Amino acid sequence: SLINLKIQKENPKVVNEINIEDLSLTKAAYCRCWRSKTFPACDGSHNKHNELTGDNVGPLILKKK
Amino acid sequence: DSLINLKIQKENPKVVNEINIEDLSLTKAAYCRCWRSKTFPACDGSHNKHNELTGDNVGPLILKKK
Ligand code: FES
Ligand code: FES
């Protein structure tokens, strides 16, 4: 049932705040699988998780107007 | 190690959500990273029960504006 295996395990609730107006990218993918090496950004690790596990998780994509 | 999402759109082989800056109403909006929210992709604090039951430490992503 653990979702997060390794990230900031000394912190009892990992919460990331992002300033959506400071997007340096036209879109930006944010991780919902707790496997990204760029966490809280998405690096595509979700694909390795889904393949390993048979899961169907993917990122939240933030997009500029 | 094992499944993260148990229930949400299991018919969909990859659940991706997009959000437009301009569609964000509030100065802050919480997005779920635990796959337990009844308002997915929004966070409704279901992570708290998940954390208490499993000894996990997951929390939402907060998008801040203005
Ligand atoms: S690396 Fe986790 S959702 Fe993409
Ligand atoms: S309900 Fe899932 S992170 Fe809050």
Residue numbers in the entry:
A (entry chain A): 69 to 133
B (entry chain B): 68 to 133
The authors write:
NEET proteins harbor two [2Fe-2S] clusters with a unique 3Cys:1His coordination structure.
In the M1-NAF-1 structure, determined at 1.74 Å resolution, only one extra density of M1 molecule is present in between two NAF-1 homodimers. The M1 molecule binds NAF-1 in the same area as observed in the mNT co-structure with carbonyl oxygens of the thiophene core forming salt bridges with Lys81 (equivalent of Lys55 of mNT) and does not interact with NAF-1 His114 (equivalent of His87 of mNT). However, the structure of M1-NAF-1 indicates that M1 is unable to form a hydrogen bond with Lys95 (equivalent of Lys68 of mNT). Consequently, Lys95 is able to form a salt bridge with Glu85 (2.7 Å distance). Moreover, the surface of mNT and NAF-1 show hydrophobic residues facing the hydrophobic moieties of M1 (<4.5 Å) suggesting hydrophobic interactions between M1 and the mNT/NAF-1 protein. A second important difference from the binding mode of furosemide to mNT is that the oxygen of the benzamide moiety of M1 molecule makes a hydrogen bond with mNT-Lys68 or shifts the position of NAF-1-Lys95. In the native protein, hydrogen bond formation between Lys55/Lys81 and His87/His114 (mNT/NAF-1), is critical for cluster stability with His87/His114 in effect performing a gatekeeper function which is compromised upon M1 binding to Lys55/Lys81 to result in higher lability of the bound clusters. Taken together the structures of M1-mNT/NAF-1 strongly suggest that in addition to His87/His114, interactions with Lys55/81 and cross-talk between the β-cap and the cluster binding area are also playing an important role in mNT and NAF-1 cluster lability/stability.
